[PDB]
Coordinates of all heavy atoms in Angstrom, one line a residue:
Chain A
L1 N -60.7 -23.3 3.8 CA -59.5 -22.5 3.5 C -58.7 -22.2 4.7 O -57.4 -22.2 4.6 CB -60.0 -21.2 2.8 CG -60.8 -21.5 1.5 CD1 -61.6 -20.2 1.1 CD2 -59.8 -21.9 0.4
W2 N -59.3 -22.0 5.9 CA -58.6 -21.8 7.1 C -57.8 -23.0 7.5 O -56.7 -22.9 8.0 CB -59.5 -21.4 8.2 CG -59.9 -20.0 8.2 CD1 -61.2 -19.4 8.1 CD2 -59.0 -18.8 8.2 NE1 -61.1 -18.1 8.1 CE2 -59.8 -17.7 8.2 CE3 -57.7 -18.7 8.3 CZ2 -59.3 -16.4 8.2 CZ3 -57.1 -17.4 8.3 CH2 -57.9 -16.3 8.3
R3 N -58.3 -24.2 7.2 CA -57.6 -25.4 7.6 C -56.4 -25.7 6.7 O -55.3 -26.1 7.1 CB -58.6 -26.6 7.5 CG -59.4 -26.8 8.8 CD -60.4 -27.9 8.7 NE -61.2 -28.0 10.0 CZ -60.9 -28.7 11.0 NH1 -59.8 -29.5 11.0 NH2 -61.6 -28.7 12.1
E4 N -56.6 -25.4 5.4 CA -55.4 -25.4 4.5 C -54.3 -24.4 4.9 O -53.1 -24.7 4.9 CB -55.8 -25.3 3.0 CG -56.4 -24.0 2.7 CD -56.7 -23.8 1.3 OE1 -56.5 -24.7 0.5 OE2 -57.1 -22.6 0.9
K5 N -54.8 -23.2 5.3 CA -53.8 -22.2 5.8 C -53.2 -22.7 7.1 O -52.0 -22.5 7.3 CB -54.6 -20.9 6.1 CG -53.7 -19.9 6.7 CD -54.1 -18.4 6.3 CE -53.2 -17.4 7.1 NZ -53.4 -16.1 6.5
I6 N -53.9 -23.4 7.9 CA -53.4 -23.9 9.2 C -52.3 -24.9 8.9 O -51.2 -24.9 9.5 CB -54.5 -24.5 10.0 CG1 -55.3 -23.4 10.8 CG2 -53.9 -25.5 11.0 CD1 -56.7 -23.8 11.2
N7 N -52.5 -25.8 7.9 CA -51.5 -26.8 7.5 C -50.3 -26.1 6.9 O -49.1 -26.5 7.3 CB -52.1 -27.8 6.5 CG -53.2 -28.6 7.1 OD1 -53.4 -28.7 8.3 ND2 -54.0 -29.2 6.2
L8 N -50.5 -25.1 6.1 CA -49.3 -24.4 5.5 C -48.5 -23.7 6.6 O -47.3 -23.8 6.6 CB -49.8 -23.4 4.4 CG -48.7 -22.7 3.6 CD1 -49.3 -22.3 2.2 CD2 -48.2 -21.5 4.3
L9 N -49.2 -23.0 7.5 CA -48.5 -22.4 8.6 C -47.8 -23.4 9.5 O -46.8 -23.1 10.1 CB -49.5 -21.5 9.4 CG -49.9 -20.2 8.7 CD1 -51.1 -19.7 9.4 CD2 -48.7 -19.2 8.7
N10 N -48.4 -24.6 9.7 CA -47.7 -25.6 10.4 C -46.4 -26.1 9.8 O -45.4 -26.3 10.5 CB -48.7 -26.9 10.6 CG -49.9 -26.6 11.5 OD1 -49.7 -25.9 12.5 ND2 -51.0 -27.1 11.1
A11 N -46.4 -26.2 8.5 CA -45.2 -26.5 7.7 C -44.2 -25.4 8.0 O -43.0 -25.7 8.3 CB -45.5 -26.7 6.3
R12 N -44.6 -24.2 7.8 CA -43.6 -23.1 8.0 C -43.1 -23.1 9.4 O -41.9 -22.9 9.6 CB -44.3 -21.7 7.7 CG -44.6 -21.5 6.2 CD -45.4 -20.2 6.0 NE -45.5 -19.9 4.6 CZ -46.2 -18.8 4.1 NH1 -46.8 -18.0 5.0 NH2 -46.3 -18.6 2.8
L13 N -44.0 -23.3 10.4 CA -43.6 -23.3 11.8 C -42.6 -24.4 12.1 O -41.6 -24.2 12.9 CB -44.8 -23.4 12.7 CG -44.6 -23.3 14.2 CD1 -44.1 -21.9 14.6 CD2 -45.9 -23.5 14.9
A14 N -42.8 -25.6 11.5 CA -41.9 -26.7 11.7 C -40.5 -26.4 11.1 O -39.5 -26.7 11.8 CB -42.5 -28.0 11.1
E15 N -40.5 -25.8 9.9 CA -39.2 -25.4 9.4 C -38.5 -24.4 10.3 O -37.3 -24.6 10.6 CB -39.4 -24.8 8.0 CG -38.2 -24.0 7.5 CD -37.0 -24.8 7.4 OE1 -37.1 -26.1 7.5 OE2 -35.9 -24.3 7.2
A16 N -39.2 -23.4 10.8 CA -38.6 -22.4 11.7 C -38.1 -23.1 13.0 O -37.0 -22.8 13.4 CB -39.6 -21.3 12.0
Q17 N -38.9 -24.0 13.5 CA -38.5 -24.7 14.8 C -37.2 -25.6 14.6 O -36.4 -25.6 15.4 CB -39.6 -25.5 15.3 CG -40.8 -24.6 15.9 CD -42.0 -25.4 16.2 OE1 -42.1 -26.6 15.8 NE2 -42.9 -24.8 16.9
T18 N -37.2 -26.3 13.4 CA -36.0 -27.1 13.2 C -34.7 -26.2 13.0 O -33.7 -26.5 13.6 CB -36.2 -27.9 11.9 OG1 -37.3 -28.8 12.0 CG2 -34.9 -28.7 11.5
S19 N -34.9 -25.0 12.3 CA -33.8 -24.1 12.3 C -33.4 -23.6 13.6 O -32.2 -23.5 14.0 CB -34.1 -22.9 11.4 OG -33.0 -22.1 11.1
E20 N -34.4 -23.3 14.5 CA -34.1 -22.9 15.9 C -33.3 -23.9 16.6 O -32.3 -23.6 17.3 CB -35.4 -22.6 16.6 CG -35.3 -22.0 17.9 CD -36.7 -21.8 18.6 OE1 -37.6 -21.3 17.9 OE2 -36.8 -22.2 19.8
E21 N -33.7 -25.2 16.5 CA -33.0 -26.3 17.3 C -31.5 -26.4 16.8 O -30.6 -26.5 17.6 CB -33.7 -27.6 17.1 CG -35.1 -27.6 17.8 CD -35.0 -28.2 19.2 OE1 -34.0 -27.9 19.9 OE2 -35.9 -29.0 19.6
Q22 N -31.3 -26.4 15.5 CA -30.0 -26.5 14.9 C -29.1 -25.3 15.4 O -28.0 -25.5 15.8 CB -30.0 -26.6 13.4 CG -30.5 -28.0 12.9 CD -30.4 -28.1 11.4 OE1 -29.6 -27.4 10.8 NE2 -31.1 -29.1 10.9
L23 N -29.7 -24.1 15.3 CA -28.9 -22.9 15.7 C -28.6 -23.0 17.2 O -27.5 -22.6 17.7 CB -29.7 -21.7 15.4 CG -29.8 -21.3 14.0 CD1 -30.9 -20.3 13.7 CD2 -28.4 -20.8 13.5
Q24 N -29.5 -23.6 18.0 CA -29.3 -23.7 19.5 C -28.1 -24.7 19.7 O -27.2 -24.4 20.5 CB -30.5 -24.3 20.1 CG -30.3 -24.8 21.5 CD -29.5 -23.9 22.4 OE1 -29.4 -22.7 22.1 NE2 -28.9 -24.5 23.5
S25 N -28.1 -25.8 19.0 CA -26.9 -26.7 19.1 C -25.6 -26.1 18.7 O -24.6 -26.2 19.4 CB -27.2 -28.0 18.3 OG -26.1 -28.9 18.5
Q26 N -25.6 -25.3 17.6 CA -24.4 -24.7 17.1 C -24.0 -23.6 18.1 O -22.8 -23.5 18.4 CB -24.7 -24.0 15.8 CG -24.9 -25.1 14.6 CD -25.3 -24.4 13.3 OE1 -25.6 -23.2 13.3 NE2 -25.4 -25.2 12.3
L27 N -24.9 -22.9 18.7 CA -24.6 -21.9 19.7 C -23.9 -22.5 20.9 O -22.9 -22.0 21.4 CB -25.8 -21.1 20.1 CG -25.7 -20.0 21.1 CD1 -24.7 -18.9 20.7 CD2 -27.0 -19.4 21.4
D28 N -24.5 -23.6 21.4 CA -23.8 -24.2 22.6 C -22.4 -24.8 22.2 O -21.5 -24.6 23.0 CB -24.7 -25.4 23.0 CG -25.9 -25.0 23.9 OD1 -26.0 -23.7 24.1 OD2 -26.7 -25.8 24.3
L29 N -22.3 -25.3 21.0 CA -20.9 -25.8 20.7 C -19.9 -24.7 20.6 O -18.8 -24.8 21.0 CB -21.0 -26.6 19.3 CG -19.7 -27.2 18.8 CD1 -19.1 -28.1 19.9 CD2 -19.9 -27.9 17.5
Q30 N -20.4 -23.5 20.0 CA -19.5 -22.4 20.0 C -19.2 -21.8 21.4 O -18.1 -21.3 21.6 CB -20.1 -21.3 19.1 CG -19.2 -20.1 18.8 CD -17.9 -20.6 18.1 OE1 -16.8 -20.0 18.3 NE2 -18.0 -21.6 17.3
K31 N -20.1 -21.9 22.3 CA -19.8 -21.6 23.7 C -18.7 -22.5 24.2 O -17.8 -22.0 24.9 CB -21.0 -21.7 24.6 CG -22.0 -20.6 24.3 CD -23.3 -20.8 25.1 CE -24.4 -19.8 24.8 NZ -25.7 -20.2 25.3
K32 N -18.8 -23.8 23.9 CA -17.7 -24.7 24.4 C -16.4 -24.3 23.8 O -15.3 -24.3 24.5 CB -18.1 -26.1 24.0 CG -17.3 -27.2 24.8 CD -17.8 -28.6 24.4 CE -17.0 -29.7 25.2 NZ -17.5 -31.0 24.9
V33 N -16.4 -24.0 22.5 CA -15.1 -23.6 21.8 C -14.6 -22.3 22.5 O -13.4 -22.1 22.6 CB -15.3 -23.4 20.3 CG1 -14.1 -22.8 19.7 CG2 -15.6 -24.8 19.7
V34 N -15.5 -21.4 22.9 CA -15.1 -20.2 23.6 C -14.4 -20.5 24.9 O -13.4 -19.9 25.2 CB -16.4 -19.3 23.8 CG1 -16.1 -18.3 25.0 CG2 -16.7 -18.6 22.6
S35 N -15.0 -21.5 25.6 CA -14.3 -21.9 26.9 C -12.9 -22.5 26.6 O -12.0 -22.2 27.4 CB -15.2 -23.0 27.6 OG -14.8 -23.1 28.9
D36 N -12.8 -23.3 25.5 CA -11.5 -23.8 25.2 C -10.5 -22.7 24.9 O -9.4 -22.7 25.5 CB -11.6 -24.8 24.1 CG -12.2 -26.1 24.5 OD1 -12.3 -26.4 25.7 OD2 -12.6 -26.9 23.5
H37 N -10.8 -21.8 24.0 CA -9.9 -20.7 23.7 C -9.7 -19.8 25.0 O -8.7 -19.2 25.2 CB -10.5 -19.8 22.6 CG -10.0 -20.2 21.3 ND1 -8.8 -19.9 20.8 CD2 -10.7 -20.9 20.3 CE1 -8.7 -20.4 19.5 NE2 -9.8 -21.0 19.2
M38 N -10.7 -19.9 25.9 CA -10.6 -19.1 27.1 C -9.5 -19.6 28.0 O -8.6 -18.8 28.5 CB -11.9 -19.1 27.9 CG -12.2 -18.1 29.0 SD -11.8 -16.5 28.4 CE -11.1 -15.7 29.8
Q39 N -9.5 -20.9 28.2 CA -8.4 -21.5 28.9 C -7.0 -21.4 28.2 O -6.0 -21.3 28.8 CB -8.7 -23.0 29.2 CG -9.7 -23.2 30.3 CD -10.2 -24.6 30.3 OE1 -9.6 -25.6 30.0 NE2 -11.5 -24.8 30.7
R40 N -7.1 -21.4 26.9 CA -5.8 -21.2 26.1 C -5.3 -19.8 26.4 O -4.1 -19.6 26.7 CB -6.0 -21.3 24.6 CG -4.8 -21.0 23.8 CD -4.9 -21.2 22.3 NE -3.8 -20.6 21.6 CZ -3.3 -20.9 20.5 NH1 -3.8 -21.9 19.8 NH2 -2.3 -20.2 19.9
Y41 N -6.1 -18.8 26.4 CA -5.7 -17.4 26.7 C -5.2 -17.4 28.2 O -4.3 -16.6 28.5 CB -6.9 -16.5 26.6 CG -6.6 -15.1 27.2 CD1 -5.5 -14.4 26.9 CD2 -7.5 -14.5 28.0 CE1 -5.2 -13.1 27.4 CE2 -7.3 -13.3 28.6 CZ -6.2 -12.6 28.3 OH -5.9 -11.3 28.8
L42 N -5.8 -18.2 29.0 CA -5.2 -18.4 30.4 C -3.8 -18.9 30.4 O -2.9 -18.2 31.0 CB -6.1 -19.3 31.2 CG -7.2 -18.7 32.0 CD1 -8.1 -19.7 32.6 CD2 -6.5 -17.8 33.1
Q43 N -3.5 -20.0 29.7 CA -2.2 -20.6 29.8 C -1.1 -19.7 29.2 O 0.0 -19.6 29.8 CB -2.2 -22.0 29.1 CG -3.0 -23.0 29.8 CD -3.4 -24.2 29.0 OE1 -2.9 -24.3 27.8 NE2 -4.4 -25.0 29.5
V44 N -1.3 -19.1 28.1 CA -0.3 -18.3 27.4 C -0.1 -17.1 28.2 O -0.9 -16.7 29.1 CB -0.7 -18.0 26.0 CG1 -0.9 -19.2 25.2 CG2 -2.0 -17.1 25.9
Chain B
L1 N -61.4 2.2 20.4 CA -61.1 1.0 21.1 C -59.8 0.4 20.6 O -59.0 -0.2 21.4 CB -62.2 0.0 20.9 CG -63.5 0.4 21.6 CD1 -64.7 -0.3 20.9 CD2 -63.5 0.0 23.1
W2 N -59.5 0.5 19.3 CA -58.2 0.1 18.8 C -57.1 1.0 19.3 O -56.0 0.5 19.5 CB -58.2 0.0 17.3 CG -58.9 -1.2 16.7 CD1 -60.0 -1.2 16.0 CD2 -58.4 -2.5 16.9 NE1 -60.3 -2.5 15.7 CE2 -59.4 -3.3 16.2 CE3 -57.3 -3.1 17.5 CZ2 -59.2 -4.7 16.1 CZ3 -57.2 -4.5 17.4 CH2 -58.1 -5.3 16.8
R3 N -57.3 2.2 19.5 CA -56.3 3.1 20.1 C -56.0 2.6 21.6 O -54.9 2.6 22.0 CB -56.8 4.5 20.1 CG -56.6 5.2 18.8 CD -57.5 6.4 18.6 NE -57.6 6.7 17.2 CZ -57.1 7.7 16.6 NH1 -56.4 8.6 17.2 NH2 -57.3 7.9 15.3
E4 N -57.1 2.3 22.3 CA -56.9 1.7 23.7 C -56.1 0.4 23.6 O -55.2 0.2 24.4 CB -58.2 1.5 24.3 CG -58.2 1.1 25.8 CD -59.5 1.2 26.5 OE1 -60.5 1.0 25.9 OE2 -59.5 1.6 27.7
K5 N -56.4 -0.4 22.6 CA -55.7 -1.6 22.4 C -54.2 -1.4 22.1 O -53.3 -2.1 22.6 CB -56.3 -2.4 21.2 CG -55.7 -3.7 20.8 CD -55.6 -4.7 22.0 CE -55.4 -6.1 21.5 NZ -54.9 -7.0 22.6
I6 N -54.0 -0.4 21.3 CA -52.6 0.0 20.9 C -51.8 0.4 22.2 O -50.7 0.1 22.4 CB -52.6 1.1 19.9 CG1 -52.9 0.5 18.5 CG2 -51.2 1.8 19.9 CD1 -53.2 1.6 17.5
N7 N -52.5 1.3 23.0 CA -51.8 1.7 24.2 C -51.5 0.6 25.2 O -50.4 0.5 25.7 CB -52.7 2.8 24.9 CG -52.9 4.0 24.1 OD1 -52.2 4.2 23.1 ND2 -53.9 4.8 24.4
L8 N -52.5 -0.3 25.3 CA -52.2 -1.5 26.2 C -51.1 -2.4 25.7 O -50.3 -2.9 26.4 CB -53.5 -2.3 26.4 CG -53.4 -3.6 27.3 CD1 -52.7 -3.3 28.6 CD2 -54.7 -4.2 27.5
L9 N -51.1 -2.6 24.3 CA -50.1 -3.4 23.8 C -48.7 -2.8 23.7 O -47.7 -3.5 23.8 CB -50.5 -3.8 22.3 CG -51.5 -5.0 22.3 CD1 -52.1 -5.1 21.0 CD2 -50.8 -6.3 22.7
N10 N -48.7 -1.4 23.7 CA -47.4 -0.7 23.9 C -46.9 -1.0 25.4 O -45.7 -1.2 25.6 CB -47.6 0.7 23.7 CG -47.2 1.1 22.2 OD1 -46.0 1.3 21.9 ND2 -48.2 1.3 21.4
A11 N -47.8 -0.9 26.3 CA -47.5 -1.2 27.7 C -47.0 -2.6 27.9 O -46.0 -2.9 28.6 CB -48.6 -0.9 28.6
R12 N -47.7 -3.6 27.2 CA -47.3 -5.0 27.4 C -46.0 -5.3 26.6 O -45.2 -6.1 27.1 CB -48.4 -5.8 26.8 CG -49.6 -5.9 27.7 CD -50.7 -6.8 27.1 NE -51.8 -7.0 28.0 CZ -51.8 -7.9 29.0 NH1 -50.8 -8.8 29.1 NH2 -52.9 -8.0 29.8
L13 N -45.8 -4.6 25.5 CA -44.5 -4.9 24.7 C -43.3 -4.4 25.5 O -42.3 -5.1 25.4 CB -44.6 -4.1 23.4 CG -43.4 -4.2 22.5 CD1 -43.0 -5.6 22.2 CD2 -43.6 -3.4 21.2
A14 N -43.4 -3.3 26.2 CA -42.3 -2.9 27.0 C -42.0 -3.9 28.1 O -40.8 -4.2 28.4 CB -42.5 -1.5 27.6
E15 N -43.0 -4.5 28.7 CA -42.8 -5.5 29.8 C -42.1 -6.7 29.3 O -41.3 -7.3 29.9 CB -44.2 -5.8 30.4 CG -44.1 -6.8 31.5 CD -45.4 -7.0 32.3 OE1 -46.5 -7.0 31.6 OE2 -45.4 -7.0 33.5
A16 N -42.6 -7.2 28.1 CA -41.9 -8.4 27.5 C -40.5 -8.1 27.2 O -39.6 -9.0 27.4 CB -42.7 -8.9 26.3
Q17 N -40.2 -6.9 26.7 CA -38.8 -6.6 26.4 C -38.0 -6.5 27.7 O -36.8 -6.9 27.7 CB -38.7 -5.2 25.6 CG -39.1 -5.3 24.2 CD -39.0 -4.0 23.4 OE1 -38.9 -3.0 24.1 NE2 -38.9 -4.1 22.1
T18 N -38.6 -6.0 28.7 CA -37.9 -5.9 30.0 C -37.6 -7.3 30.6 O -36.5 -7.5 31.1 CB -38.7 -5.1 31.0 OG1 -38.9 -3.8 30.6 CG2 -38.1 -5.1 32.4
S19 N -38.6 -8.2 30.5 CA -38.3 -9.6 30.9 C -37.2 -10.2 30.1 O -36.3 -10.9 30.6 CB -39.6 -10.4 30.8 OG -39.4 -11.7 31.3
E20 N -37.2 -10.0 28.7 CA -36.2 -10.5 27.9 C -34.8 -10.0 28.3 O -33.8 -10.7 28.3 CB -36.5 -10.1 26.4 CG -35.5 -10.5 25.4 CD -35.7 -9.8 24.0 OE1 -36.9 -9.6 23.7 OE2 -34.8 -9.5 23.4
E21 N -34.8 -8.7 28.6 CA -33.5 -8.0 29.0 C -33.1 -8.5 30.3 O -31.9 -8.6 30.6 CB -33.7 -6.5 28.9 CG -33.7 -6.0 27.5 CD -34.2 -4.5 27.4 OE1 -34.5 -4.0 28.5 OE2 -34.3 -4.0 26.3
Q22 N -34.0 -8.8 31.2 CA -33.6 -9.4 32.5 C -33.0 -10.7 32.4 O -32.0 -11.0 33.0 CB -34.9 -9.5 33.4 CG -35.2 -8.2 34.1 CD -36.4 -8.3 35.1 OE1 -37.0 -9.4 35.1 NE2 -36.7 -7.2 35.8
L23 N -33.5 -11.6 31.5 CA -32.9 -12.9 31.3 C -31.6 -12.7 30.6 O -30.6 -13.5 30.8 CB -33.9 -13.8 30.5 CG -35.1 -14.1 31.2 CD1 -36.1 -14.9 30.4 CD2 -34.8 -15.0 32.5
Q24 N -31.5 -11.7 29.7 CA -30.2 -11.4 29.1 C -29.2 -11.0 30.1 O -28.0 -11.4 30.1 CB -30.4 -10.3 28.0 CG -29.1 -9.7 27.5 CD -28.3 -10.7 26.6 OE1 -28.9 -11.3 25.7 NE2 -27.0 -10.8 26.8
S25 N -29.6 -10.2 31.1 CA -28.8 -9.8 32.2 C -28.3 -11.0 33.1 O -27.2 -11.0 33.6 CB -29.5 -8.7 33.1 OG -28.6 -8.2 34.1
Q26 N -29.2 -11.9 33.3 CA -28.9 -13.1 34.0 C -27.8 -13.9 33.2 O -26.8 -14.5 33.8 CB -30.1 -14.0 34.2 CG -31.0 -13.5 35.3 CD -32.3 -14.2 35.4 OE1 -32.6 -15.1 34.6 NE2 -33.1 -13.9 36.4
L27 N -27.9 -14.0 31.9 CA -26.9 -14.6 31.1 C -25.6 -13.9 31.2 O -24.5 -14.5 31.4 CB -27.4 -14.6 29.6 CG -26.5 -15.4 28.6 CD1 -27.4 -16.0 27.5 CD2 -25.5 -14.5 28.0
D28 N -25.6 -12.6 31.2 CA -24.4 -11.8 31.3 C -23.8 -12.0 32.7 O -22.6 -11.9 32.9 CB -24.7 -10.3 31.0 CG -24.9 -10.1 29.6 OD1 -24.2 -10.8 28.7 OD2 -25.6 -9.1 29.2
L29 N -24.7 -12.2 33.7 CA -24.2 -12.4 35.1 C -23.5 -13.7 35.2 O -22.5 -13.9 35.9 CB -25.3 -12.3 36.1 CG -25.0 -12.6 37.5 CD1 -24.0 -11.7 38.1 CD2 -26.3 -12.6 38.4
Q30 N -24.0 -14.8 34.5 CA -23.3 -16.0 34.5 C -22.0 -15.9 33.8 O -21.0 -16.4 34.3 CB -24.2 -17.1 33.8 CG -24.0 -18.5 34.3 CD -24.5 -18.7 35.7 OE1 -25.6 -18.3 36.0 NE2 -23.6 -19.2 36.5
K31 N -21.9 -15.1 32.7 CA -20.6 -14.9 32.1 C -19.7 -14.1 33.0 O -18.5 -14.3 33.0 CB -20.8 -14.2 30.7 CG -21.4 -15.1 29.7 CD -21.3 -14.4 28.3 CE -21.7 -15.4 27.2 NZ -21.6 -14.8 25.8
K32 N -20.2 -13.2 33.8 CA -19.4 -12.4 34.8 C -18.9 -13.4 35.8 O -17.7 -13.2 36.3 CB -20.3 -11.3 35.4 CG -19.5 -10.4 36.3 CD -20.4 -9.4 37.0 CE -19.7 -8.5 37.9 NZ -20.6 -7.5 38.6
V33 N -19.6 -14.3 36.3 CA -19.1 -15.3 37.2 C -18.0 -16.1 36.5 O -16.9 -16.4 37.2 CB -20.2 -16.3 37.7 CG1 -19.7 -17.5 38.4 CG2 -21.2 -15.5 38.5
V34 N -18.1 -16.5 35.3 CA -17.1 -17.1 34.5 C -15.8 -16.2 34.5 O -14.7 -16.7 34.7 CB -17.5 -17.4 33.1 CG1 -16.4 -17.6 32.1 CG2 -18.4 -18.6 33.1
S35 N -16.0 -14.9 34.3 CA -14.9 -14.0 34.3 C -14.2 -13.9 35.6 O -13.0 -13.7 35.7 CB -15.3 -12.6 33.8 OG -14.2 -11.7 33.6
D36 N -15.0 -13.9 36.7 CA -14.4 -13.9 38.0 C -13.5 -15.1 38.3 O -12.4 -15.0 38.8 CB -15.4 -13.7 39.1 CG -16.0 -12.3 39.2 OD1 -15.4 -11.4 38.6 OD2 -17.1 -12.1 39.8
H37 N -14.1 -16.3 38.0 CA -13.3 -17.5 38.1 C -12.1 -17.5 37.2 O -11.0 -18.0 37.6 CB -14.2 -18.7 37.9 CG -15.2 -18.9 38.9 ND1 -15.0 -18.9 40.2 CD2 -16.6 -19.1 38.7 CE1 -16.1 -19.1 40.9 NE2 -17.1 -19.2 40.0
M38 N -12.2 -17.0 36.0 CA -11.0 -16.6 35.2 C -10.0 -15.8 36.0 O -8.9 -16.2 36.1 CB -11.5 -15.8 34.0 CG -10.5 -15.3 33.0 SD -9.5 -16.5 32.2 CE -8.1 -15.4 31.7
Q39 N -10.4 -14.7 36.5 CA -9.4 -13.8 37.2 C -8.8 -14.5 38.4 O -7.7 -14.2 38.8 CB -10.1 -12.5 37.7 CG -10.3 -11.5 36.5 CD -10.7 -10.1 37.0 OE1 -10.6 -9.8 38.2 NE2 -11.2 -9.3 36.0
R40 N -9.5 -15.5 39.0 CA -8.9 -16.3 40.0 C -7.8 -17.2 39.4 O -6.7 -17.4 40.0 CB -9.9 -17.2 40.7 CG -9.3 -18.0 41.9 CD -10.4 -18.7 42.7 NE -9.8 -19.4 43.8 CZ -10.5 -20.0 44.8 NH1 -11.8 -19.9 44.8 NH2 -9.9 -20.6 45.8
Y41 N -8.1 -17.9 38.3 CA -7.1 -18.8 37.7 C -5.8 -18.1 37.3 O -4.7 -18.6 37.5 CB -7.7 -19.5 36.4 CG -6.9 -20.6 35.9 CD1 -7.1 -21.9 36.4 CD2 -5.9 -20.4 34.9 CE1 -6.3 -23.0 35.9 CE2 -5.2 -21.5 34.4 CZ -5.4 -22.7 34.9 OH -4.6 -23.8 34.4
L42 N -5.9 -16.9 36.8 CA -4.7 -16.1 36.4 C -3.8 -15.9 37.6 O -2.6 -16.1 37.5 CB -5.1 -14.7 35.9 CG -5.6 -14.7 34.4 CD1 -6.2 -13.3 34.1 CD2 -4.5 -15.0 33.4
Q43 N -4.4 -15.5 38.8 CA -3.6 -15.3 40.0 C -2.9 -16.6 40.4 O -1.7 -16.5 40.8 CB -4.5 -14.7 41.1 CG -5.0 -13.3 40.8 CD -6.2 -12.9 41.6 OE1 -6.6 -13.7 42.5 NE2 -6.8 -11.8 41.3
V44 N -3.6 -17.7 40.4 CA -3.0 -18.9 40.9 C -2.3 -19.6 39.7 O -2.4 -19.3 38.6 CB -4.1 -19.9 41.4 CG1 -4.9 -19.1 42.5 CG2 -5.0 -20.4 40.3

């Protein structure tokens, strides 16, 4: 029963980690967009 | 013994939060460097 629980928790953990990675990529891209708007605010 | 455990884990939890906040402060310091270079670009 502990091994089946381990497998289920592994599945949940993998889902969480994939969400983490995708959110990380999105956060970095939004930082880049922030820099672009930042230079725009500079020019205007 | 569980009360002692609770006290030690309260002590440890504060330390982890402090390390988290220190890394957050480093992130904010990087953004502050960004803001200083910003303020340079405006002048020039």
Side-chain angles (χ1 to χ4, degrees):
Chain A
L1 299 164
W2 279 122
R3 279 177 179 265
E4 60 174 7
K5 175 149 177 169
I6 281 156
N7 295 345
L8 188 153
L9 286 164
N10 291 321
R12 290 174 173 181
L13 184 63
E15 165 57 15
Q17 289 169 347
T18 298
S19 187
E20 186 181 313
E21 290 267 38
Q22 288 187 19
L23 287 165
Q24 167 46 22
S25 184
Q26 291 172 355
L27 177 59
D28 281 359
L29 181 57
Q30 191 55 216
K31 288 175 187 165
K32 195 176 180 178
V33 171
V34 159
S35 197
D36 287 344
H37 271 283
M38 193 51 214
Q39 284 165 33
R40 174 175 168 158
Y41 171 49
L42 267 170
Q43 288 160 13
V44 302
Chain B
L1 292 156
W2 279 115
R3 282 158 198 252
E4 186 164 36
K5 178 57 159 165
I6 283 167
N7 298 343
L8 176 54
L9 278 165
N10 266 277
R12 288 179 172 274
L13 176 57
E15 179 171 45
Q17 284 182 344
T18 297
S19 185
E20 178 191 324
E21 286 167 0
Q22 276 181 357
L23 294 173
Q24 170 71 47
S25 183
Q26 287 173 353
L27 187 147
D28 287 329
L29 174 62
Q30 212 64 52
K31 286 190 174 185
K32 187 182 176 181
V33 169
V34 160
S35 185
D36 285 347
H37 293 311
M38 178 60 198
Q39 284 190 16
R40 184 175 181 168
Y41 190 87
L42 281 171
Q43 292 161 5
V44 308

